[PDB]
Symmetry: D2
Subunit: 125 residues, 4 copies
């Protein structure tokens, strides 16, 4: 099993009230669903990603990332978000991320294609 | 099939000489391998991601993203990169991305955990 | 005077314990000093920047940005940080920022030149 | 004088056809004007920033950054952009940047406040 397979797997919530449901595989896989509390989104979207299944044992966090394309059976926002961050284990476990949201654009609007932000996920709230 | 399933699937190269080998699934999946020409990396790493399988038909690009965790059988850089971008089809097809590279860090060094950059992928070179 | 000239001018502290001392000019100027609690830094560094001196009156925040080059009489970290964000007025005034830290690099290391992060500044702590 | 004071001072153009007119001071200051070819912008806007006036002599680039608040006598886009990057001297001098564009937003829309992109400036075109 991955060192933090058990720590990462489950339900996480961010500061916006979004819900991230993830399974961490022994081999580094992340699979699950994302539900955004904000933006052009409804219900759950597929996510996939990767994590470091053998992190440093010096108290460093565990690097990971995942992607959501904002298409499901309900809506298509012609966009994708990637979260890049680290899992920090312990009593108040956190996933601390920064994210990039890219929209499909014309060449003329491509300079404005991409938003950047930061989300912090906890196991409560 | 996804609108750009055929356009995205295959081998791509970026401005650094890295190699991205991807299969686009009918359902929005991206699966493949990444080989970085730079950094703490050797040989291929697993990637997974997502793309908009039903993009706008107004000449906008196709949003997509993917993740590599920099662990394979050879090396572990305790880091993950996410690329967020859009596929632009036609004679000189491109994937234009921005990326976030997060390292596992101590809490003291977490302010310096994440690099940001931009890669442009083409089908030649 | 700028709408938030009085609100912005003064001493701010971020989540790292850094100190930002700024004067907002009637014309949109930001001038002052920055002292980082972390990284290759000691004592104060010059900053300059700009803010929107006539923001929207719909309860939107006030856009602003500034730069520090990490050279002073004590040290030179061959780097510069830019903070981009908005001032949100009221009882618990905040400046919410994202930042880019670029180091001078060789062409070979330029892919790793730039860090991205987020700082939140308050008038206390 | 700054090592690259003479190299930086003058007129630069980016890949969008924007015009950046900058004076580099002996002490690290950047002052000038910016004219964007794209977005909610017309004519020139004030910029200020900083650069490393004593860079490494190992062939590394020169770190620098600057800010534009998108208010002038013609328009107010209630936003500010910061460019963070490095100057690379020689026959085909370049300023390679990444940028953050923050808009004033309501708290509800603050997750979508900030765009990220990359501009490359040359002395011709």
């Amino acid at each position: 099993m991955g060192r933090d397979e058990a720590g990462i797997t489950g339900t996480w919530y961010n500061q916006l009230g979004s819900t991230f449901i993830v399974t961490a595989g022994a081999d580094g896989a992340l699979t699950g669903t994302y539900e955004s509390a904000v933006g052009n989104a409804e219900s759950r979207y597929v996510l996939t990603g990767r994590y470091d299944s053998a992190p440093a044992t010096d108290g460093s966090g565990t690097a990971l990332g995942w992607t959501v394309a904002w298409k499901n059976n309900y809506r298509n926002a012609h966009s994708a978000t990637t979260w890049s961050g680290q899992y920090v284990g312990g009593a108040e476990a956190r996933i601390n991320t920064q994210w990039l949201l890219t929209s499909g654009t014309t060449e003329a609007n491509a300079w404005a294609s991409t938003y950047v932000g930061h989300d912090t996920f906890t196991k409560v709230k």
